[PDB]
């Protein structure tokens, strides 16, 4: 095994662990067993962002973006209850972990989206009436997406929520409705959902891993303008241990 | 239909007691008996419903439920805000002396 | 103004016994504190735990007080966390601690007295300034 | 021999602007950092400098004016990494971190340092006295410390100075703010040297003037009774000399011309030296003198000087700078 | 990126390069006082 | 602090860095003796 | 005598420039300031001894030559508690004796010695420009040099052996036994980028390294000692440099300029030859303590710090370089290439380790953080600790400030001195070093440049 | 338009520098 | 006390300008 002298400054730290294609077997679930998600790792690989149309009748398809924020992507280290449910559906918990990742890419033109990467909160299920993770086992969940800044964030003029101005004091005598949206902060929370498909099992040690599939909101600058919807795609891996 | 939700919140008795369900932990610094095991059981099981509901905290023994008791009076429990509850600001809201 | 054994008069024990220390016991107090002390409670607060101060009030207001000699010099034999239900002199220095600590080994019975009567006197002499950081600097 | 022919190019006192091997490595460092200073001056995105995902702004194209302009530090995050092209992803990625901020000052720091180098080989090459180019070492050593020893000893060229008036303007109260600049000997020995040599500029120049030779009339300038190359002195030293020796006492007033342009030299140079020096040892945060609660009365109480207004002052700035970039009480860095 | 950057590599190599071996190609004689 | 034994000599060591500056200072007193020639 | 402008061409403010060609005197003079050298170490040994507080860390005392002596394992224990401080007594002592011997020499070749020894010897009067004489010299001085680093080897591995702070379950002093002799490994150091996370020779962080490194030294010192008496400089190098004693000066003083920097890093980054027990902890160390000390803080209180978000996005504790490592949070983000033995039982393959850190962060790493971030080297030039801001109640300005910015500027002078010896050199050679001649001035038998 | 204005004058100052340099009054011994 | 320090360095700071003096007075090389 690789020690942090090995990895450190070669981009490694940010990869999922992968699995052997030599693992097409099946981890046996029992339901009377409590199982724990140990590891949850997901790697981004593609960011999409939905353009907007002028046109509102536009079919506003999605459009593929570069990233700028570096190898800081990846969510790692995701802990969680995998409970069985009485339709045999399993259902992972997330408990805590580095479940976030501020990732900013640039679409065509030079527009910088910033996006709070996350899987807070997650809630993910199965298939119904599922006795093992196969390659056809496929977690479906949702997710919460806070916002992108909290509530002590500062803007360029001195205005936060739980902090600062809440007025252009730069301009004292201006008329205050046009500044309105730029004066008031608000703390948007939202939902997330997500898709993981499992493409490998090694049932031995319990390890699944497989590729996913997001949709979250991008940043709305605490309220100044409107987010965008951003699909993440990547792969993933997690550990699924008896208790 | 634009306000800020903290200076709402200040108006509310979040801004006269400690609210249960949304107050940094160390203003519980301010009473006696309180920090810091009485109010990490009080941060790790919000929300409540009732102020009284913090008297089934699984795992007080009858001296927490005591100080509790006595210092019930200074608690109030508001609806849960995200603004001050997420990013752990509940633990760390970012104000040291 | 001038040091006055009226300002030098703090609360011994937790009954209500006062005591007046001398400017000399003052002045070994306060060398005494930033000796062992001031390198994290300097002007009265705590820099790797700001959410406790040196103030009087918080130190009534710990389980057991403080406010007084007799609570701080038993603090700096057995420090206990705020409401008193955990032991800390792993991480506080202490007279048990002083194998860890070294800065305590040579701190007699009389030293202890002096740095608890620094940190009770101090408030009394800057007002708010003690315990209030650099908003009061 | 090709190899000859072009050493006696490069080494040639009748180029119009004189090359020589530092200029060899001169002239394509230079000519780098001042078109990527350019470029990035007119054009470049906005740039997190903090490295918390807050980018700044500092481009003429996207709403910048002379004045608030800059080429923005690298960020934060990266740190005292070297970051060059190749090292990023894509340019847009090497625009978003700060890279031409480090490719301008790596390129300048080279290019100045091969300046003072090139100084020295024309002053060789002409038969010169060599020691022009120790004059120009103390702004030479400024721009080290502002832009190379700062960030070494605070850990990140972010902290280097921006390339840019109120960029500038930031680096030097945030300097205040963090390091009590004023309250240091150091700068204050550069303050007394830099206001010393205007000083005695406008002292030499107003003395050398008023003892000009009459060689014209009131109808032409007084510039042309000089001829360039003339062996006559335009100016009479020893009129100069008495009248300065009756404005102050006579012993204050250099006769010796040689003396007192090596006073000239001397002063400004050995003054910006310290205050070079003071930049890169309160980079290793040795910072300038702390009199806060100094003054004590009998009681106790702390009587405020003019020490304790400037640290209002500071603590104000230090409040206030990157408002967003601190978890954590001490700022360590 | 890959390209460019021995792309530098090669032109700083050969600059100096340039700078070693030029100040290896009897420099203090080029003075004009006493070219020894 | 020192060995026991040396603690009578403790002001002459609390005096004995500063002597290389002495030293300098010493050059410029020649130097005066001499007439700086 | 040639002790006058008259006679010598020098004024007063450049006498010892009448010591060039006068080799007696000029030895007298070397000879007195390795004499003043070898007096302040042992003065100053004995002024911090008298004035140590052997329970007091020494980087609280204002210490700079004690922590030397206790990095090569004199007189400290595990820990880096001090055990004995008798051998910095003996290093002192010794110093001011040897200096008393060295300052007798010194005065007899400068006021009473022949002014030149070529007439007594052939062997100790040199000529600056016999250039066989000059490399047998410096032959002779770097046998001696390689001599000294096999001193520090024989110190390490036979003698007691050296300070590790990286040693197994704490900083002691160990016996080196199996130094890195591999050249991969330690000319892979001088091959080292120096910038962040690569940091050149300042990056050594074992004494494996460093003892391996010293024979390699001691070895190359003594083989090019003995290739310079045996051999004569090569057509190449005779016309390449300058061959007086201005110049050999002049490049003398590059040289230890280029070493005041490296030695300015070396004490400001390294914590392995400069152990933060004696000479406090770096700035990058304090910072990561910092940052270290409130995530225990906070995890006591409660708080997930994997998931703890800060005011910008980014996590308030916990946050990825970007190379994806695991790194601690805030600004302290530019100190992520820090290693600390404090902090490496918590870091992982992907670096820090949420389990370990949630589990594992044992009662003395967490005294440590908290001294660390306590004893940052910030303070003022009044030693007052912290930053430029707080009140005068501690004293304190760490020794790694004091010897950073100490050699700085001194590296920054002999970099200028360096400058005008070189210059000054080259025009002495040229022979133009006392102004342009009236009748021969270059300029003007040039063509014009328009 | 203020950019423009902005890189207007800094163009004329380097053509300005051009022109002083390489197309000076030529310095003339006398 | 301190007059013990003040003594030995009034005593060194002596002991250099008396060799100086010393030299001066009976026309040493000096
Ligand atoms: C800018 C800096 C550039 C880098 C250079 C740094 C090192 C320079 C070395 C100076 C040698 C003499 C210093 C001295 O003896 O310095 C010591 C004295 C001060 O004495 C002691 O200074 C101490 C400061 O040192 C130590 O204080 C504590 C010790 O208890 C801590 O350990 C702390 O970290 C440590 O710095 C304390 O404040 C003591 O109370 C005090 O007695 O400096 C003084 O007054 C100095 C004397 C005043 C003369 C003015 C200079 C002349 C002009 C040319
Ligand atoms: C006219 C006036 C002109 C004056 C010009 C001054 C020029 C000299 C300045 C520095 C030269 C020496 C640089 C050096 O020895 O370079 C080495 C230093 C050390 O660098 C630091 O080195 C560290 C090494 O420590 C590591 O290893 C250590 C082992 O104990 C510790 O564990 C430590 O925590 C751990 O991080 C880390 O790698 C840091 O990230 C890294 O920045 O570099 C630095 O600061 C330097 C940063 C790049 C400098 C590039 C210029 C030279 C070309
Ligand atoms: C490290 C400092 C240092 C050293 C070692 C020297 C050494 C020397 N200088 Mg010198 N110098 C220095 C700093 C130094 N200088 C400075 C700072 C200046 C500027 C002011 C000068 C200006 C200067 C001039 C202008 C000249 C010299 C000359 C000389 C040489 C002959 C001295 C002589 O005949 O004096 C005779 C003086 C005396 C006999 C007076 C007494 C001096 C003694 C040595 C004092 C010893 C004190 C000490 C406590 C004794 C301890 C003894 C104990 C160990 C037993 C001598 C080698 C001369 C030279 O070049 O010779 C050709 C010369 O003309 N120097
Ligand atoms: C090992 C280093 C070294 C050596 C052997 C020399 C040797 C020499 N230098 Mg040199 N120099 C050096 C380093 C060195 N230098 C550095 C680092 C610099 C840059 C600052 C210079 C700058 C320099 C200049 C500008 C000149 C020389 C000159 C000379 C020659 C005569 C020097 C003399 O008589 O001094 C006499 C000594 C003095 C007048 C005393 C100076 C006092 C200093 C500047 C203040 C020190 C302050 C102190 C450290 C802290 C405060 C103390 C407190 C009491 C206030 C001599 C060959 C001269 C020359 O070219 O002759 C051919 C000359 O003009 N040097
Ligand atoms: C590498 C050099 C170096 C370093 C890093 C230190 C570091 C330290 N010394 Mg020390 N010391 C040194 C050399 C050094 N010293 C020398 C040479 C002497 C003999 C005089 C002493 C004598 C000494 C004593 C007696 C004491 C210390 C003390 C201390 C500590 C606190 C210092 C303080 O308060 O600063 C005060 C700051 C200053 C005095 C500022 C000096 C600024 C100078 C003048 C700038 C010079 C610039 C340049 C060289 C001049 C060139 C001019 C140009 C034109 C060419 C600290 C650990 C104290 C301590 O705590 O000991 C335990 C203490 O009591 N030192
Ligand atoms: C770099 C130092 C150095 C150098 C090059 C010289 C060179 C010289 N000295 Mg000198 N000397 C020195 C230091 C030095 N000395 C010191 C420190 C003292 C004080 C004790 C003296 C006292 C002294 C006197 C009193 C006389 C000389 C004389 C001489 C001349 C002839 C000596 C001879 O034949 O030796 C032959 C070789 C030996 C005697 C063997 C010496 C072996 C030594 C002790 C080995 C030491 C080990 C190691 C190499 C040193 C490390 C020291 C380091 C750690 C500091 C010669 C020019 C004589 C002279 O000029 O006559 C006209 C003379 O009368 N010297
Ligand atoms: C104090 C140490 C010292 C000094 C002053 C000298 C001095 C000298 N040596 Mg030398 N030498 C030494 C130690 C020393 N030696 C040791 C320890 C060895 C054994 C390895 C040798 C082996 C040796 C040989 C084999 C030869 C010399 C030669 C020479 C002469 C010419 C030097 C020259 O042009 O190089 C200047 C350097 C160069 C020309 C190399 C190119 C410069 C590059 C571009 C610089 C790159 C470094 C850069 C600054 C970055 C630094 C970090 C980097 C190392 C990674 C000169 C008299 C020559 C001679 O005449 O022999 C009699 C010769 O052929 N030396
Ligand atoms: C996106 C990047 C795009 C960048 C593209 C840049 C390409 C450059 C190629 C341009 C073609 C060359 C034109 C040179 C003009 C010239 O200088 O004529 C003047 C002479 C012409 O050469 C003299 O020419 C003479 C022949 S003749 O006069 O031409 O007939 C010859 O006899 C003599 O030896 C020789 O010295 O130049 C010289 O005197 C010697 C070379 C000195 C000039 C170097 C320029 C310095 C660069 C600036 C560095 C710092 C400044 C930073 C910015 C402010
Ligand atoms: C030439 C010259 C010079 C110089 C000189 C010099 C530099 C010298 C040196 C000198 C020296 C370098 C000296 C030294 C000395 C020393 C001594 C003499 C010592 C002694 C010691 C002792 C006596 C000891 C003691 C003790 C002990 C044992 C322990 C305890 C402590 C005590 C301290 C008590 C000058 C500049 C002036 C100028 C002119 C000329
Ligand atoms: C690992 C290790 C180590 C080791 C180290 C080593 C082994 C080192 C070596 C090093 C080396 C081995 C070095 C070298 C260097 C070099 C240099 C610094 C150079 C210089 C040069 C010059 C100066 C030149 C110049 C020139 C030019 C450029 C051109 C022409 C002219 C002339 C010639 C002038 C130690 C001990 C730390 C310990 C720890 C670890
Ligand atoms: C064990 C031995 C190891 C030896 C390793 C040696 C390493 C360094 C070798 C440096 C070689 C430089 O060699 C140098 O090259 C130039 C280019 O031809 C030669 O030639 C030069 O001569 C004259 C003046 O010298 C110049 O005007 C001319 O333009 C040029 O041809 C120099 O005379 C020679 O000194
Ligand atoms: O980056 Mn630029 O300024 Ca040097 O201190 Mn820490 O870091 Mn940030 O705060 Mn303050
Ligand atoms: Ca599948
Ligand atoms: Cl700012
Ligand atoms: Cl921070
Ligand atoms: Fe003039």
Same mark, same amino acid.
Request: proline share 5%; charged share 15%.
């Given at each position: 095994?690789?020690?942090?002298?090995?990895?450190?400054?070669?981009?490694?730290?940010?990869?999922?662990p992968?699995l052997?294609?030599?693992?097409?077997? &099946?981890?046996?679930?029992?339901?009377?067993?409590?199982?724990?998600?140990?590891?949850?790792?997901?790697?981004?690989?593609?960011?999409?962002?939905?353009?907007?149309?002028?046109?509102?009748?536009?079919?506003?398809?999605?459009?593929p973006?570069?990233?700028?924020?570096?190898?800081?992507?990846?969510?790692?280290?995701?802990?969680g209850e995998?409970?069985?449910?009485?339709?045999?559906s399993? %259902?992972?918990?997330?408990?805590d972990?580095i479940?976030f990742?501020?990732?900013?890419?640039?679409?065509?033109?030079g527009?910088?989206?910033?996006?709070?990467?996350?899987?807070?909160?997650?809630?993910?299920?199965?298939?119904?009436?599922?006795?093992?993770?196969?390659?056809?086992?496929?977690?479906?969940?949702?997710?919460?997406?806070?916002?992108?800044?909290?509530?002590?964030?500062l803007?360029?003029?001195?205005?936060?929520?739980?902090?600062?101005?809440?007025?252009?004091?730069?301009?004292?005598?201006?008329?205050?409705?046009e500044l309105?949206?730029?004066?008031?902060?608000?703390?948007?929370?939202?939902?997330?959902?997500?898709?993981?498909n499992?493409?490998?099992?090694?049932?031995?040690?319990?390890?699944i891993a497989?590729?996913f599939e997001?949709?979250?909101?991008?940043?709305?600058?605490?309220g100044?303008?409107?987010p965008?919807?951003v699909?993440?795609?990547?792969?993933?891996?997690?550990?699924?241990?008896?208790? | 239909?634009?306000?800020?939700?903290?200076?709402?919140?200040?108006?509310?008795?979040?801004?006269?007691?400690?609210?249960?369900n949304?107050?940094?932990?160390?203003?519980?610094?301010?009473?006696?008996?309180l920090?810091?095991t #009485?109010?990490?059981?009080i941060v790790?099981?919000?929300?409540?419903?009732?102020?009284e509901?913090?008297?089934?905290?699984?795992?007080?023994?009858?001296?927490?439920?005591?100080?509790?008791?006595?210092?019930?009076?200074?608690?109030?429990?508001?609806?849960?805000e995200?603004a001050?509850?997420?990013?752990?600001?509940?633990?760390?809201?970012?104000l040291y002396? | 103004?001038?040091?006055?054994?009226?300002?030098?008069?703090?609360?011994?024990?937790?009954?209500?016994?006062?005591?007046?220390?001398?400017?000399?016991?003052?002045?070994e107090?306060?060398?005494?504190?930033?000796?062992?002390?001031?390198?994290?409670?300097?002007g009265?607060?705590?820099?790797?735990?700001?959410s406790?101060?040196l103030?009087?009030?918080t130190?009534?207001?710990?389980?057991?007080?403080?406010?007084?000699?007799?609570?701080?010099?038993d603090?700096?034999?057995n420090?206990?966390?705020?409401?008193?239900?955990?032991?800390?002199?792993?991480?506080?220095?202490?007279?048990?601690?002083?194998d860890?600590?070294?800065?305590?080994?040579?701190?007699?019975?009389?030293?202890?007295?002096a740095?608890?009567?620094?940190?009770?006197?101090?408030?009394?002499?800057?007002?708010?300034?003690?315990?209030?950081?650099?908003?009061?600097? | 021999?090709?190899w000859?022919?072009?050493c006696?190019?490069?080494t040639?006192?009748?180029?119009?602007?004189?090359?020589?091997?530092?200029?060899?490595?001169?002239?394509?460092?230079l000519?780098?950092?001042?078109?990527?200073?350019?470029?990035?001056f007119?054009?470049?995105?906005?740039?997190?400098?903090?490295?918390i995902?807050?980018?700044?702004?500092?481009?003429?194209?996207?709403g910048?004016?002379?004045?608030?302009?800059?080429?923005?530090?690298?960020?934060?995050?990266?740190?005292?990494? /070297?970051?060059?092209?190749?090292?990023?992803?894509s340019?847009?990625?090497?625009?978003?971190?700060?890279?031409?901020?480090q490719?301008?000052?790596?390129?300048?720091?080279?290019?100045?340092s091969?300046?003072?180098?090139?100084?020295?080989?024309?002053?060789?090459? #002409?038969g010169?006295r060599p020691?022009?180019?120790?004059?120009?070492?103390?702004?030479?050593?400024?721009?080290?410390?502002?832009?190379?020893?700062?960030?070494?000893?605070?850990?990140?060229?972010?902290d280097?100075?921006?390339?840019?008036?109120?960029?500038t303007?930031?680096?030097?109260?945030?300097?205040?703010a963090?390091?009590?600049?004023?309250?240091?000997?150091?700068?204050?020995?550069?303050? &007394?040297?830099?206001?010393?040599?205007?000083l /005695?500029?406008?002292?030499?120049?107003?003395?050398?003037?008023?003892?000009?030779?009459?060689?014209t %009339?009131?109808?032409?300038?007084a510039?042309?009774?000089?001829?360039?190359?003339?062996?006559?002195e335009?100016?009479?030293?020893?009129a100069?000399?008495?009248?300065?020796?009756?404005?102050?006492?006579?012993?204050?007033?250099?006769?010796?011309?040689?003396?007192?342009?090596?006073?000239?030299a001397?002063?400004?140079?050995?003054?910006?030296?310290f205050?070079?020096?003071?930049?890169?040892?309160?980079?290793?945060?040795?910072?300038?003198?702390?009199?806060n +609660?100094?003054?004590?009365?009998?009681?106790?109480?702390?009587i405020?000087?003019?020490?304790?207004?400037?640290?209002?002052a500071?603590?104000?700035?230090?409040?206030?700078?990157?408002?967003?970039?601190?978890?954590?009480?001490?700022?360590?860095? | 990126?890959?390209?460019?950057?021995?792309?530098?590599?090669?032109?700083?190599?050969?600059?100096?390069?340039?700078?070693?071996?030029?100040?290896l190609?009897?420099?203090?004689?080029?003075?004009?006082?006493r070219?020894? | 602090?020192?060995?026991?034994?040396?603690?009578?000599?403790?002001?002459?060591?609390?005096?004995?860095?500063?002597?290389?500056?002495?030293?300098?200072? #010493?050059?410029?007193?020649?130097?005066?003796?001499?007439?700086?020639? | 005598?040639?002790?006058?402008?008259?006679?010598?061409?020098?004024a007063?403010?450049?006498?010892?420039?009448r010591?060039?060609?006068?080799?007696?005197?000029?030895?007298?003079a070397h000879?007195? +300031?390795?004499?003043?050298?070898?007096?302040?170490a042992?003065?100053?040994?004995?002024?911090?001894?008298?004035?140590?507080?052997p329970?007091?860390?020494?980087?609280?005392?204002?210490?700079?030559?004690?922590? +030397?002596? &206790?990095?090569?394992?004199?007189?400290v224990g595990?820990?880096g508690?001090?055990?004995?401080?008798?051998?910095?007594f003996?290093?002192?002592?010794?110093?001011?004796?040897?200096?008393?011997?060295?300052?007798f020499?010194?005065?007899?070749?400068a006021?009473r010695?022949?002014?030149?020894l070529?007439?007594?010897?052939?062997?100790?009067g040199?000529?600056?420009?016999?250039?066989?004489k000059?490399?047998?010299?410096?032959?002779?001085?770097?046998?001696?040099?390689?001599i000294g680093?096999?001193?520090?080897v024989?110190? &390490?591995?036979?003698?007691?052996?050296?300070?590790?702070?990286?040693?197994?379950?704490?900083?002691?002093?160990?016996?080196?036994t199996?130094?890195?002799?591999?050249?991969?490994?330690?000319?892979?150091?001088?091959?080292?980028?120096?910038?962040?996370?690569?940091?050149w020779?300042?990056?050594?962080?074992?004494?494996?390294?460093?003892?391996?490194? +010293?024979?390699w030294?001691?070895?190359?010192?003594?083989a090019?000692?003995?290739?310079?008496?045996?051999?004569?400089?090569?057509?190449?190098?005779?016309?390449?440099?300058?061959?007086?004693?201005?110049?050999?000066?002049?490049?003398?003083?590059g040289?230890?300029?280029?070493?005041?920097?490296?030695?300015?890093?070396?004490?400001?980054?390294?914590?392995?030859?400069?152990?933060?027990?004696?000479?406090?902890?770096?700035?990058?160390?304090?910072?990561?303590?910092?940052?270290?000390t /409130?995530?225990?803080?906070?995890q006591?209180?409660?708080?997930?710090?994997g998931?703890?978000?800060?005011?910008?996005?980014?996590?308030?504790?916990?946050?990825?370089?970007?190379?994806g490592?695991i790194?601690?949070?805030?600004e302290?983000?530019?100190?992520?290439?820090?290693?600390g033995?404090?902090?490496?039982?918590?870091?992982?393959?992907?670096?820090?380790?949420?389990?370990?850190?949630?589990?594992?962060?044992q009662?003395?790493?967490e005294?440590?953080?908290?001294?660390?971030?306590?004893?940052?080297?910030?303070?003022?030039?009044?030693?007052?600790?912290?930053?430029?801001?707080?009140?005068?109640?501690?004293?304190?300005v760490?020794?790694?400030?004091?010897?950073?910015?100490?050699?700085?500027?001194?590296?920054?002078?002999?970099?200028?001195?360096? #400058?005008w010896?070189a210059?000054?050199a080259?025009?002495?050679?040229?022979?133009?070093?006392?102004?342009?001649?009236?009748?021969?001035?270059?300029?003007?038998?040039?063509?014009?440049?328009? | 338009?203020?950019?423009?204005?902005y890189?207007?004058?800094?163009?004329?100052?380097?053509?300005?520098?051009?022109?002083?340099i390489?197309?000076?009054?030529?310095?003339?011994?006398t | 006390?301190?007059?013990?320090?003040?003594?030995?360095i009034?005593?060194?700071?002596?002991?250099?300008?008396?060799?100086?003096?010393?030299?001066?007075?009976?026309?040493?090389?000096?």
């Amino acid at each position: 095994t690789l020690t942090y002298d090995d990895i450190v400054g070669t981009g490694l730290a940010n990869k999922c662990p992968t699995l052997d294609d030599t693992a097409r077997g &099946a981890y046996p679930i029992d339901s009377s067993q409590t199982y724990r998600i140990a590891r949850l790792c997901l790697q981004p690989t593609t960011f999409l962002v939905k353009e907007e149309p002028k046109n509102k009748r536009q079919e506003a398809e999605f459009v593929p973006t570069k990233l700028v924020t570096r190898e800081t992507t990846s969510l790692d280290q995701i802990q969680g209850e995998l409970k069985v449910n009485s339709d045999g559906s399993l %259902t992972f918990v997330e408990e805590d972990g580095i479940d976030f990742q501020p990732v900013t890419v640039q679409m065509a033109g030079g527009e910088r989206i910033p996006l709070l990467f996350t899987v807070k909160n997650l809630v993910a299920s199965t298939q119904p009436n599922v006795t093992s993770i196969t390659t056809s086992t496929d977690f479906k969940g949702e997710f919460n997406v806070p916002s992108y800044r909290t509530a002590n964030f500062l803007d360029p003029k001195g205005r936060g929520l739980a902090s600062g101005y809440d007025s252009a004091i730069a301009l004292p005598q201006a008329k205050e409705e046009e500044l309105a949206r730029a004066n008031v902060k608000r703390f948007s929370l939202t939902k997330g959902q997500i898709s993981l498909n499992v493409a490998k099992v090694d049932g031995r040690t319990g390890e699944i891993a497989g590729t996913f599939e997001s949709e979250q909101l991008s940043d709305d600058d605490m309220g100044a303008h409107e987010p965008h919807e951003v699909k993440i795609q990547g792969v993933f891996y997690a550990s699924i241990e008896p208790a | 239909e634009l306000v800020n939700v903290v200076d709402e919140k200040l108006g509310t008795a979040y801004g006269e007691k400690i609210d249960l369900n949304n107050t940094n932990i160390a203003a519980f610094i301010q009473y006696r008996g309180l920090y810091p095991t #009485l109010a990490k059981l009080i941060v790790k099981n919000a929300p409540y419903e009732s102020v009284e509901d913090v008297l089934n905290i699984p795992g007080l023994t009858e001296r927490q439920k005591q100080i509790l008791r006595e210092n019930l009076e200074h608690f109030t429990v508001t609806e849960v805000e995200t603004a001050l509850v997420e990013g752990g600001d509940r633990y760390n809201n970012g104000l040291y002396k | 103004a001038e040091l006055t054994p009226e300002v030098l008069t703090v609360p011994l024990n937790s009954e209500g016994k006062t005591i007046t220390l001398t400017e000399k016991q003052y002045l070994e107090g306060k060398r005494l504190f930033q000796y062992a002390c001031a390198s994290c409670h300097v002007g009265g607060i705590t820099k790797t735990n700001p959410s406790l101060d040196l103030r009087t009030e918080t130190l009534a207001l710990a389980t057991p007080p403080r406010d007084n000699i007799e609570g701080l010099v038993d603090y700096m034999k057995n420090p206990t966390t705020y409401d008193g239900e955990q032991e800390i002199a792993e991480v506080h220095p202490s007279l048990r601690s002083a194998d860890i600590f070294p800065k305590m080994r040579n701190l007699t019975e009389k030293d202890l007295v002096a740095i608890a009567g620094h940190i009770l006197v101090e408030p009394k002499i800057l007002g708010d300034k003690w315990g209030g950081g650099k908003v009061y600097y | 021999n090709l190899w000859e022919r072009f050493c006696n190019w490069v080494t040639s006192t009748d180029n119009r602007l004189y090359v020589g091997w530092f200029g060899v490595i001169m002239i394509p460092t230079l000519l780098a950092a001042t078109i990527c200073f350019v470029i990035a001056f007119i054009a470049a995105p906005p740039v997190d400098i903090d490295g918390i995902r807050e980018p700044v702004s500092g481009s003429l194209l996207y709403g910048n004016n002379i004045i608030t302009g800059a080429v923005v530090p690298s960020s934060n995050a990266i740190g005292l990494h /070297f970051y060059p092209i190749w090292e990023a992803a894509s340019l847009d990625e090497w625009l978003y971190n700060g890279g031409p901020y480090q490719l301008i000052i790596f390129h300048f720091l080279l290019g100045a340092s091969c300046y003072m180098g090139r100084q020295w080989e024309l002053s060789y090459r #002409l038969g010169m006295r060599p020691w022009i180019c120790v004059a120009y070492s103390a702004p030479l050593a400024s721009a080290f410390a502002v832009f190379l020893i700062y960030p070494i000893g605070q850990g990140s060229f972010s902290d280097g100075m921006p390339l840019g008036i109120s960029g500038t303007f930031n680096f030097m109260i945030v300097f205040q703010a963090e390091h009590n600049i004023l309250m240091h000997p150091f700068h204050q020995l550069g303050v &007394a040297g830099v206001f010393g040599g205007a000083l /005695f500029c406008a002292m030499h120049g107003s003395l050398v003037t008023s003892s000009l030779i009459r060689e014209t %009339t009131e109808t032409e300038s007084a510039n042309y009774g000089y001829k360039f190359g003339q062996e006559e002195e335009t100016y009479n030293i020893v009129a100069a000399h008495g009248y300065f020796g009756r404005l102050i006492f006579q012993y204050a007033s250099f006769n010796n011309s040689r003396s007192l342009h090596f006073f000239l030299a001397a002063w400004p140079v050995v003054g910006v030296w310290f205050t070079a020096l003071g930049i890169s040892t309160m980079a290793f945060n040795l910072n300038g003198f702390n009199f806060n +609660h100094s003054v004590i009365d009998a009681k106790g109480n702390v009587i405020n000087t003019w020490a304790d207004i400037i640290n209002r002052a500071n603590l104000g700035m230090e409040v206030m700078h990157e408002r967003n970039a601190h978890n954590f009480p001490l700022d360590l860095a | 990126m890959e390209t460019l950057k021995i792309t530098v590599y090669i032109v700083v190599t050969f600059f100096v390069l340039l700078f070693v071996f030029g100040f290896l190609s009897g420099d203090p004689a080029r003075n004009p006082k006493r070219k020894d | 602090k020192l060995p026991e034994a040396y603690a009578i000599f403790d002001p002459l060591v609390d005096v004995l860095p500063v002597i290389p500056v002495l030293f300098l200072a #010493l050059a410029f007193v020649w130097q005066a003796a001499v007439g700086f020639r | 005598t040639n002790r006058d402008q008259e006679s010598s061409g020098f004024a007063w403010w450049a006498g010892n420039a009448r010591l060039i060609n006068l080799s007696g005197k000029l030895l007298g003079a070397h000879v007195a +300031h390795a004499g003043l050298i070898v007096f302040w170490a042992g003065a100053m040994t004995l002024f911090e001894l008298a004035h140590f507080i052997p329970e007091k860390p020494m980087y609280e005392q204002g210490l700079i030559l004690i922590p +030397h002596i &206790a990095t090569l394992g004199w007189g400290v224990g595990p820990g880096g508690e001090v055990v004995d401080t008798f051998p910095f007594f003996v290093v002192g002592v010794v110093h001011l004796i040897s200096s008393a011997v060295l300052g007798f020499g010194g005065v007899y070749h400068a006021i009473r010695g022949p002014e030149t020894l070529e007439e007594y010897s052939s062997f100790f009067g040199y000529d600056w420009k016999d250039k066989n004489k000059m490399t047998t010299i410096l032959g002779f001085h770097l046998i001696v040099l390689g001599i000294g680093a096999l001193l520090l080897v024989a110190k &390490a591995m036979f003698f007691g052996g050296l300070y590790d702070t990286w040693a197994p379950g704490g900083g002691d002093v160990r016996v080196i036994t199996n130094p890195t002799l591999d050249p991969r490994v330690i000319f892979g150091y001088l091959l080292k980028s120096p910038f962040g996370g690569e940091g050149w020779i300042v990056s050594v962080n074992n004494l494996e390294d460093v003892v391996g490194g +010293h024979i390699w030294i001691g070895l190359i010192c003594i083989a090019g000692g003995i290739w310079h008496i045996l051999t004569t400089p090569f057509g190449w190098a005779r016309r390449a440099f300058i061959w007086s004693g201005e110049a050999y000066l002049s490049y003398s003083l590059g040289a230890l300029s280029m070493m005041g920097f490296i030695a300015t890093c070396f004490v400001w980054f390294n914590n392995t030859v400069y152990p933060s027990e004696f000479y406090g902890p770096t700035g990058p160390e304090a910072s990561q303590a910092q940052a270290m000390t /409130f995530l225990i803080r906070d995890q006591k209180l409660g708080a997930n710090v994997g998931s703890a978000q800060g005011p910008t996005g980014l996590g308030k504790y916990l946050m990825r370089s970007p190379t994806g490592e695991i790194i601690f949070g805030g600004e302290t983000m530019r100190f992520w290439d820090f290693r600390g033995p404090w902090l490496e039982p918590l870091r992982g393959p992907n670096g820090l380790d949420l389990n370990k850190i949630k589990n594992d962060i044992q009662p003395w790493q967490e005294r440590r953080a908290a001294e660390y971030m306590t004893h940052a080297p910030l303070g003022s030039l009044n030693s007052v600790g912290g930053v430029a801001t707080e009140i005068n109640s501690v004293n304190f300005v760490s020794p790694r400030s004091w010897l950073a910015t100490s050699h700085f500027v001194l590296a920054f002078f002999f970099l200028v001195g360096h #400058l005008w010896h070189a210059g000054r050199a080259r025009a002495a050679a040229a022979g133009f070093e006392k102004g342009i001649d009236r009748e021969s001035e270059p300029v003007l038998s040039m063509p014009s440049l328009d | 338009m203020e950019t423009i204005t902005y890189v207007f004058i800094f163009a004329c100052i380097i053509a300005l520098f051009f022109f002083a340099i390489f197309f000076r009054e030529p310095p003339r011994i006398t | 006390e301190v007059i013990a320090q003040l003594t030995m360095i009034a005593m060194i700071g002596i002991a250099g300008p008396m060799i100086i003096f010393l030299l001066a007075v009976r026309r040493g090389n000096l």
